[PDB]
Write an enzyme that holds these catalytic residues in place. Structure first.
Site, PDB file in Angstrom:
ATOM      1  N   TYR A 226     -10.289   2.371 -13.040  1.00 13.63           N
ATOM      2  CA  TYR A 226      -9.804   2.641 -11.691  1.00 13.63           C
ATOM      3  C   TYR A 226      -9.545   1.357 -10.942  1.00 13.63           C
ATOM      4  CZ  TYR A 226      -9.872   3.976  -6.717  1.00 13.63           C
ATOM      5  OH  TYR A 226      -9.569   4.132  -5.375  1.00 13.63           O
TER       6      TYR A 226
ATOM      7  N   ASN B 212      -7.333  -0.207  -7.346  1.00 14.69           N
ATOM      8  CA  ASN B 212      -6.344  -0.521  -6.321  1.00 14.69           C
ATOM      9  C   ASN B 212      -5.925  -1.944  -6.623  1.00 14.69           C
ATOM     10  OD1 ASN B 212      -8.665   1.113  -4.254  1.00 14.69           O
ATOM     11  ND2 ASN B 212      -6.674   2.017  -4.781  1.00 14.69           N
TER      12      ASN B 212
ATOM     13  N   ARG C 156       3.345   8.465  -2.791  1.00 23.50           N
ATOM     14  CA  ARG C 156       2.525   9.098  -1.792  1.00 23.50           C
ATOM     15  C   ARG C 156       2.589   8.388  -0.468  1.00 23.50           C
ATOM     16  NH1 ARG C 156      -1.714   7.614  -5.385  1.00 23.50           N
ATOM     17  NH2 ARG C 156      -3.122   7.452  -3.586  1.00 23.50           N
TER      18      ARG C 156
ATOM     19  N   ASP D 273      -0.844   7.951   1.862  1.00 22.89           N
ATOM     20  CA  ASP D 273      -2.233   8.268   2.164  1.00 22.89           C
ATOM     21  C   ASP D 273      -2.505   7.935   3.630  1.00 22.89           C
ATOM     22  OD1 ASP D 273      -2.144   8.596  -0.578  1.00 22.89           O
ATOM     23  OD2 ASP D 273      -3.512   6.922  -1.037  1.00 22.89           O
TER      24      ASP D 273
ATOM     25  N   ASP E  77      -3.458   2.365  -8.260  1.00 23.01           N
ATOM     26  CA  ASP E  77      -2.622   2.512  -7.059  1.00 23.01           C
ATOM     27  C   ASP E  77      -1.996   1.178  -6.672  1.00 23.01           C
ATOM     28  OD1 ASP E  77      -2.685   5.234  -6.503  1.00 23.01           O
ATOM     29  OD2 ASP E  77      -4.319   5.130  -5.061  1.00 23.01           O
TER      30      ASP E  77
HETATM   31  O1  LIG Z   1      -4.316   4.529  -1.123  1.00 25.15           O
HETATM   32  C1  LIG Z   1      -5.291   3.492  -1.223  1.00 25.15           C
HETATM   33  C2  LIG Z   1      -5.299   2.673   0.051  1.00 25.15           C
HETATM   34  C3  LIG Z   1      -6.663   2.139   0.442  1.00 25.15           C
HETATM   35  C4  LIG Z   1      -7.572   1.919  -0.752  1.00 25.15           C
HETATM   36  C5  LIG Z   1      -7.802   3.184  -1.553  1.00 25.15           C
HETATM   37  C6  LIG Z   1      -6.631   4.144  -1.498  1.00 25.15           C
HETATM   38  O2  LIG Z   1      -6.541   4.863  -2.727  1.00 25.15           O
END
Ligand SMILES: O[C@H]1CCCC[C@@H]1O
Ligand SMILES: O[C@H]1CCCC[C@@H]1O
Ligand SMILES: [Cl-]
Ligand SMILES: [K+]
Ligand SMILES: [K+]
Ligand SMILES: [K+]
Ligand SMILES: [K+]
Ligand code: NI
Ligand code: NI
Ligand code: NI
Lengths: 154, 147
Positions: free
Chosen positions: A58, A60, A104, A106, A137
């Site tokens: 995982y 970012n 996306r 978020d 991401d």
């Molecule tokens: O979309 C991102 C933006 C901030 C950190 C975690 C998130 O998954």
């Protein structure tokens, strides 16, 4: 302490394909991923971690990767201490070769500052027997940080 | 000056290979990127297109796209673009890749982790958006792009 600032709601971009199938599930994998996205807004690492394989990953991207289910939960949980998902909006999803892709926005709240921000993200998911073996991401960290006064790097 | 394949790259030996005609084009469009010729690259685009490196403002329309490309090219050039993962659905194509990019004023280089989406209509790009972190590029090559 700072109040919850206004949560600006989500632009539907000019480039958002209006083929309403583009943002719809089409594989069992894609269906899973979309479901997983929905779970984010619960801001619960124990909920989320069940989606993952033991041998997973995982990251970012502007931030260090977590390798392993154990590392991922720590990273997730760590994140949930300074920020929170208000909404996740997936414009486009698609798959091939075990990877799923999500364009996306978020909607996040920096907890310490109470400030809100809408983040343009393109994520990729790797599944294997219905389990996430990777989640990465892509986005720009500086402009989130600045927008909500939350220095996250380093 | 090479690109090492990260431990999380699918070992599925098809994952990075073009699978459909749209994905063949995108893969070609990116060899074209090492030319660093805005005039050439714009060939792949429709008139009703857009282009955005998401830390920077969108460019709508083909002339914008070309110009924004040309502008970018004044301060930097690609040296390599390796693509690990490629896939598609609903006329959008996604690429997980690494762009080795060199800054013209400083000569310093940096390998950029990128995930891009492309929209194609009849083999022409009608949307190209790259997602990545801008800051670590600037800091690496000492070339500011977002004051
Ligand atoms: O979309 C991102 C933006 C901030 C950190 C975690 C998130 O998954
Ligand atoms: O791959 C990106 C990284 C640097 C800005 C433009 C380029 O398209
Ligand atoms: Cl892995
Ligand atoms: K457009
Ligand atoms: K879809
Ligand atoms: K597909
Ligand atoms: K492929
Ligand atoms: Ni304070
Ligand atoms: Ni306040
Ligand atoms: Ni307010």
């Amino acid at each position: 302490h700072h109040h919850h600032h206004h949560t600006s709601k989500i632009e539907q971009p000019r480039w958002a394909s209006k083929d309403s199938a583009a943002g719809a599930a089409s594989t069992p994998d894609e269906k899973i991923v979309l479901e997983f996205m929905d779970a984010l807004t619960s801001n619960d690492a124990a909920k989320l971690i069940e989606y993952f394989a033991e041998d997973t990953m995982y990251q970012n991207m502007p931030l260090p990767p977590a390798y392993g289910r154990d590392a991922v939960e720590q990273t997730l949980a760590g994140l949930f201490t300074v920020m929170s998902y208000d909404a996740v909006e997936t414009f486009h999803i698609g798959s091939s070769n075990g990877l799923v892709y999500t364009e996306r926005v978020d909607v996040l709240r920096a907890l310490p500052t109470g400030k809100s921000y809408n983040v343009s993200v393109l994520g990729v998911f790797q599944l294997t027997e219905g389990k996430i073996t990777g989640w990465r991401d892509y986005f720009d960290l500086r402009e989130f940080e600045e927008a909500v006064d939350l220095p996250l790097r380093g």
